[PDB]
């Protein structure tokens, strides 16, 4: 039918509009700024409680009490200042791939290959962590989850869809819309009104949590997008892929802004995070260490090395005091 | 330094002790990943028998515990990364069907040459051998229609065999997978082909023997002998 033809010409004229909006590059504007210099962060804390591969972590809003999920069916809450374990939560399913820590600090979340998003309450009268709620609507493996508040959580799963859930009712509110590939990552805006999600079809999508469908679509990768993260101001985001490349897109331009890649790295990217000011971009790779790029000059400012296996997760605390990464050698390392 | 800090340290030590005990208890058991297309009898390979997400099976052979995980959801390229540390991959393939044999060979090639399955051994189960024998003595379906090399193939002289046509068809089907497995790998991980009927009951013994051999390989590589 002519629907394919009109969709094709519609894509063509969107591309022409994007080209018309592109009058210059970010590199030309940023070439006048002096470089940030060599950044060599030091490892201060090493957390050695897990006995299997660590798949996710999440910092707390108080810059301590980071939760981490490992393949031994364990969620561990760490006091990062003293390397003290606060809570150890056993999981019914040992195949956990994501974990989230509530901004209020009263709840944690986990999920994975069991297709269940389990929310655990941390502050109970009995003094032990119990399963507060379970969400069982997704038909694929859970890939990411993020807390909007104490009662709302947005999850991205391997059924090519993302969902928004209410904890009290236990039912999903908005099922959003599907990609054409497995959704691998999700990031929340600072104003908690929009969120970006990257899928396996080399596409990222900007969604609104209120109206409930996709506002914007971004492309430019040619492999699986594995990580995504907003800019601190919420007007930009960064994606990492299996192409050994990161792309900084711009929301208000709807056009791919910056590409970070190097010739000596060919392995995929697992975790992508920004600094507090947004000047530094932290990217975890499959070559057993982490890279620190300049978000404007697009050059390798530094390297965080010391992990003996694949770096699986990254996270920068709210005040930017330190960055904690977690790898497949059952280790979490804190750097500043 | 304070009293509350010391009590928190004591709580952390208790948590560490519990974690170490649970880790040793989990270290006792062995884990397997079950793979195979539909209409292949993958679920009925082991007679002895958490259904949310991944089907779970537990069976004991000679006081050794095996936990077999079967993922019920294609999109295999993503969640396979979680299973790079299992003891073995039990690949069950139906040999009675020749239409889907090439697809099964391509699937086995994809599993064998996976980036995260470099050091994971595969135990291959050529299921439904009796149906293969019935089809090859029927004479209506021929391997030469799909695999022309069977026209130029003969059974090896060192064979240890039923009808000789059954033996040559079985050895050709096995040799395809063996050639695929021996093309790559370079000794980091090997394959263990096994013939199996739908009513067989000694598959668990074969799995146990192959797992013991794999653990022997790991122990020898640990001591820098191989």
């Amino acid at each position, epitope marked *: 039918d002519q629907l394919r033809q009109e969709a094709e010409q519609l894509k063509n004229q969107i591309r022409d509009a994007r080209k018309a909006c592109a009058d210059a590059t970010l590199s030309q504007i940023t070439n006048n700024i002096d470089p940030v210099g060599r950044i060599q962060m030091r490892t201060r804390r090493t957390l050695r409680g897990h006995l299997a591969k660590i798949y996710a972590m999440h910092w707390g809003t108080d810059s*301590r*009490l980071l939760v981490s999920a490992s393949q031994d069916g364990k969620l561990i809450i760490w*006091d990062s200042y003293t390397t*003290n374990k*606060v*809570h150890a939560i056993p999981l019914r399913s040992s195949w956990v791939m994501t974990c989230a820590y509530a901004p209020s*600090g009263n709840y944690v979340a986990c999920g994975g290959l069991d297709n269940i998003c389990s929310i655990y309450n941390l*502050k109970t*009268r*009995e*003094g*032990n962590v119990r399963v507060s709620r379970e969400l069982a609507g997704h038909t694929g493996y859970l890939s990411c989850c993020r807390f909007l508040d104490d009662n709302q959580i947005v999850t991205s799963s391997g059924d090519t869809t993302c969902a928004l859930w209410d904890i009290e009712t236990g039912q999903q509110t908005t099922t959003f819309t599907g990609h054409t590939g497995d959704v691998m990552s999700l990031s929340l805006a600072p104003d908690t009104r929009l969120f970006v999600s990257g899928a396996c079809d080399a596409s990222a999508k900007l969604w609104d949590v209120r109206e409930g469908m996709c506002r914007q679509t971004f492309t430019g990768h040619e492999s699986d997008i594995n990580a995504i993260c907003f800019f601190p101001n919420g007007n930009a985001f960064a994606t990492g892929s299996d192409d050994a490349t990161c792309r900084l897109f711009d929301l208000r331009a709807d056009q791919e802004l910056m590409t970070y890649s190097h010739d000596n790295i060919i392995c995929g990217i697992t975790s992508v995070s920004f600094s507090k000011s947004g000047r530094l971009l932290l990217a975890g790779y499959d070559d057993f260490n982490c890279n620190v790029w300049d978000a404007l000059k697009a050059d390798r400012a530094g390297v965080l090395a010391g992990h003996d296996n694949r770096v699986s997760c990254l996270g920068v605390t709210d005040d930017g005091m330190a960055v904690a990464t977690g790898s497949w050698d059952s280790f979490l390392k804190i750097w500043n | *330094l*304070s*009293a*509350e*800090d*010391k*009590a*928190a340290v*004591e*709580r952390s030590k*208790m948590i560490d002790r519990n974690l170490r005990e649970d880790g040793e208890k989990a270290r006792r058991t062995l884990r397997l990943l079950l793979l195979g297309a539909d209409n292949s009898g993958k679920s009925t390979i082991v007679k002895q028998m958490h259904t949310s997400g991944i089907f779970e099976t537990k069976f004991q052979v000679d006081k050794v515990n095996f936990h077999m995980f079967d993922v019920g959801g294609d999109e295999r390229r993503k969640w396979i990364q979680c299973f790079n540390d299992v003891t073995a991959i039990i690949f069950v393939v139906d040999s009675s069907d020749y239409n889907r044999l090439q697809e099964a060979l391509n699937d086995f090639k994809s599993i064998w040459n996976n980036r995260w399955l470099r050091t994971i051994s595969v135990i291959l189960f050529l299921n439904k051998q009796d149906l293969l024998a019935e089809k090859v003595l029927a004479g209506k379906s021929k391997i030469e229609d799909y695999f022309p090399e069977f026209a130029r193939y003969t059974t090896p002289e060192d064979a240890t065999p039923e009808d000789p046509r059954v033996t040559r068809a079985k050895y050709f089907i096995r040799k395809e997978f063996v050639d695929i497995s021996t093309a790559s790998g370079d000794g980091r991980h090997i394959c263990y082909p096994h013939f199996t009927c739908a009513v067989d009951t000694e598959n668990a013994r074969r799995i146990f023997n192959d797992c013991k051999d794999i653990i022997l390989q790991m122990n020898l590589r640990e001591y820098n002998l191989v």
Partner: single-chain antibody
Framework: DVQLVESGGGLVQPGGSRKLSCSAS????????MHWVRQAPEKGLEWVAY????????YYADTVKGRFTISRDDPKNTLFLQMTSLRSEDTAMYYC??????????????WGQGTTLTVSSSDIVMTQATSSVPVTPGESVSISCRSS???????????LYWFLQRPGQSPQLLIY???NLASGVPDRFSGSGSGTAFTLTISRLEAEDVGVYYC?????????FGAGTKLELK
């Protein structure tokens, strides 16, 4: 839901022996430190014994050291206090206190009913400097407390605990630091202070605010309570 029922009191001849038992229910008893706290029938509270989770740490008061023993039975959720060679000052009221310790924990939150024991015939000076305050409901009350040594620690915590005891009722935890309000306590309670001086402020007074207020320190191993300031309606 949380219940701590303790028994074993009564009349004991001097120099005798007595076992006090406490059964716990409604919470994971094996993961909690447990205290025995003694108050005289006319004086205030006085900490006696403490046993940590897993029974790896045991602390005794100096006045009862040697003749008192504390033990824990985790399968049946029970705490035991074996006392021998009782003196004349051991006639008192015994409370069993639940207390957990992690980063964001609030120790001393729950207290037991208590048992009555009757017999026949350095430490931080935690002062109150106020026997009682005559006051009417409606206004705001400030209660001061002081310590002989500065309670501020290098980690930023201060370890000051404001407790309330209603007449005829077990004490309850009001504030577990200077300002960290406890669970179930109304917002009208507040606390502040410095390394040595502390102030507890109550914005509004109802009929249930009558009782004795205690200030306790948790800086080091011996735990010393205050003299107790009594607030009553008049």
């Amino acid at each position: 839901d949380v219940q701590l029922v303790e028994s074993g009191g009564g009349l004991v001849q001097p120099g005798g022996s007595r076992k006090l038992s406490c059964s716990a229910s409604g919470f994971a008893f094996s993961s909690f430190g447990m205290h025995w706290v003694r108050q005289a029938p006319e004086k205030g509270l006085e900490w006696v014994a403490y046993i940590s989770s897993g029974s790896g740490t045991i602390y005794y008061a100096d006045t009862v050291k040697g003749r008192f023993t504390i033990s824990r039975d985790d399968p049946k959720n029970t705490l035991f206090l074996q006392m021998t060679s009782l003196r004349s000052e051991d006639t008192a009221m015994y409370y069993c206190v639940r207390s957990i310790y992690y980063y964001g924990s609030s120790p001393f939150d729950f207290w037991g009913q208590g048992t009555t024991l009757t017999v026949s015939s350095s430490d931080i000076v935690m002062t109150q400097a106020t026997s009682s305050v005559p006051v009417t409901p409606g206004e705001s009350v400030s209660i001061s407390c002081r310590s002989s040594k500065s309670l501020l620690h290098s980690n930023g915590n201060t370890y000051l605990y404001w407790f309330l005891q209603r007449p005829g009722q077990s004490p309850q935890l009001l504030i577990y630091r200077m300002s960290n309000l406890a669970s179930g306590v109304p917002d009208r309670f507040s606390g502040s202070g410095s390394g040595t001086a502390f102030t507890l402020t109550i914005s509004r007074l109802e009929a249930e605010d009558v009782g004795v207020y205690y200030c306790m320190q948790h800086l080091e191993y011996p735990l010393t309570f205050g003299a107790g300031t009594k607030l009553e309606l008049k």
